[PDB]
Structures are given as structure tokens and as C-alpha cells.
Amino acid sequence: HHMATFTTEQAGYQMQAILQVIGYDLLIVVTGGTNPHIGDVTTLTASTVPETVKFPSHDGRFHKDNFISERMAKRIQRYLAGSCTITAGIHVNQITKAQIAAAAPMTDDLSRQIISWLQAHPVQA
Amino acid sequence: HHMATFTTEQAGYQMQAILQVIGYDLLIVVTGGTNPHIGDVTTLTASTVPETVKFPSHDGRFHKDNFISERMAKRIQRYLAGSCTITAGIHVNQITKAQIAAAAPMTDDLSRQIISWLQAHPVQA
Ligand SMILES: [Mn+2]
Ligand SMILES: [Mn+2]
């Protein structure tokens, strides 16, 4: 009804998106790899430019999981009934080159599943 | 283990906080009243100033649920092992004056429950 879970696995590691509908608004939690976390949080509505918070990681640098959160936002923006919040934290120990390139097709694959679920479950009752 | 739910009810309406631990990081979803939603999203760590996104509501104005999200952030900041994300959407149809004043004691009551749970479940294994 108001909660769904989507997974995908390419190049030997998994990514998961957990979606929650609250009122007309959406919360999506994206994780994967060996160490799930919350690295970045992207915020948007259907007719608003997305904003992203990047949390600090180590050595003065910031988490780069916003590649995932910002791409999923662009893919699903047109379908938003209200606000949308996307958290992302994907990390694979000793990640490989083929694994890095698979991050974008995996985000698209989850985005497509989310979009299908939204069309089958109109947030308007 | 990694998920807990806290409720409180004062002046005849309820507020709920759902907490999720991901890695070392926290996601807290606060709702209540007749129409739960996601109005505002506050982001912080233990030694960082909090930032808040205010989503648009109606008539060019913005949701004011950040009163709740920003107060819960201040209450629990010292206890944070990593990043923290707090969403808030509380709305009561024809809210009353006693109900408005109860918003702050209710947020404190949830914050105290969250803090107790974090101390009993150290995010470090
Ligand atoms: Mn990260
Ligand atoms: Mn609101």
C-alpha cells in the first residue's frame, strides 16, 4: 500500500531502494554494496530544482553517493505528487572498475521500478 | 536491532518517530496529527550546524514542520555517531491552541525516547 522495496544486482553487487509514501510525499532510501550508509540526501519536488546535502566522510572530503541520489531524482521528478527525499549510501570494499560503471545502470533500473510502482499506486487514494 | 518506533500523545493528538540505523548513520521520520506528510528535512552531524530544507506548501508559503525537526536535532545532536536526517510533517485539522503548545513537549518526549534507545543500542556493533 504505502511501502515498497526494489533491488538490483549487476557486476556482482547489489543496490536496494526502499520507498515510503507519506501523505502525498515520498521518502526513498538507497543503499548497497558491503557498507550501507547515508552519505548524501537529495530533496526535490516536481517543478523545483533539486538540492543535495553532502555529509562529511573522512580526511576533510565529502561522500559522493550524490551521484546516485541526484540521478534517481532526475529520473523520477516528473512523476512526483508532492515532496521527495532521497538518501544514498553505497560502498563496496575494493570496488572494481566494472562495478563503478554499473552504478548508473543500477540506479536507472531502480528508478524504473519505482516509476512503475507509482503508476500502479496513484498517491491520490 | 536497527529500527524502532516511538509514539506520544498529548492534548488529544499523537506524534510518531520512526528511527532507522544505517551503518553509523540515522534516519528519523516524524509524523502526526490527522495528515502525516514530509514538510521539512533537517540534516546534521554531531559537530556540524544543522541545515533545513523547507518544502513549499500552498499559496507561496512553506511548511513549518521544521519547528519539530530542528528541535529534535538540537536535543539529540551530542549522541550522533555519524550523519542524521530528520523529516517532519505534522498536521491536525482545526488545530487548537492547547494542541499547538503541546508540539514542543511532544518532540522532547520523542527525543528522550530516541536518546534512551541509542544508549541501549550503541551503533558500534
Ligand atoms: Mn559514501
Ligand atoms: Mn507541513
Numbering used by the authors:
A (entry chain A), B (entry chain A): -1 to 123
Wording from the paper:
Previous studies indicated that the small protein LpdD (lp_0272) is associated with the UbiD-type gallate decarboxylase LpdC (lp_2945) in Lactobacillus plantarum. The crystal structure of the purified LpdD reveals a dimeric protein with structural similarity to the eukaryotic heterodimeric proteasome assembly chaperone Pba3/4. Solution studies demonstrate that LpdD protein specifically binds to reduced prFMN species only. The addition of the LpdD–prFMNH2 complex supports reconstitution and activation of the purified E. coli apo-UbiD in vitro, leading to modest 3,4-dihydroxybenzoic acid decarboxylation. These observations suggest that LpdD acts as a prFMNH2-binding chaperone, enabling apo-UbiD activation through enhanced prFMNH2 incorporation and subsequent oxidative maturation.
Despite multiple attempts, the crystal structure of LpdD in complex with prFMNH2 could not be determined, because of the difficulties associated with maintaining the strict anaerobic conditions required. However, LpdD crystals soaked with MnCl2 and prFMNH2 did reveal the presence of a metal ion in the electron density, coordinated by His35, His61, and Asp63 residues. Major conformational changes were observed when compared with the non–metal-bound apo-LpdD in the F53–I66 loop region, containing two of the three ligating residues. This region is highly conserved despite having no obvious structural role in the apo-LpdD, which may indicate Mn2+ binding could be relevant for activity, as is observed for UbiD enzymes. Structure elucidation reveals LpdD is similar in structure to a eukaryotic chaperone involved in 20S proteosome assembly, with a highly conserved region exposed at the protein surface. The latter includes a metal-binding site with possible relevance to function, with the conserved H35–H61–D63 providing a Mn2+-binding site. The coordination pattern allows a fourth nonprotein ligand to bind, possibly the prFMN phosphate when in complex with the cofactor, thus resembling the UbiD Mn2+-assisted prFMN binding. The presence of MnCl2 (Mn2+ is required for prFMN binding in UbiD but not UbiX) in the reconstitution buffer appears to have no noticeable effect on LpdD–prFMNH2 binding. Furthermore, WT LpdD prFMNH2 binding occurs in the absence of Mn2+, which suggests metal binding is not essential for activity. Given the LpdD conserved surface–exposed region largely consists of loop regions that are shown to alter conformation in response to either metal binding or single-site mutations, we suggest that the LpdD–prFMNH2 complex likely has a distinct conformation through induced fit binding, hindering accurate modeling of the complex on the basis of the non–cofactor-bound structures.
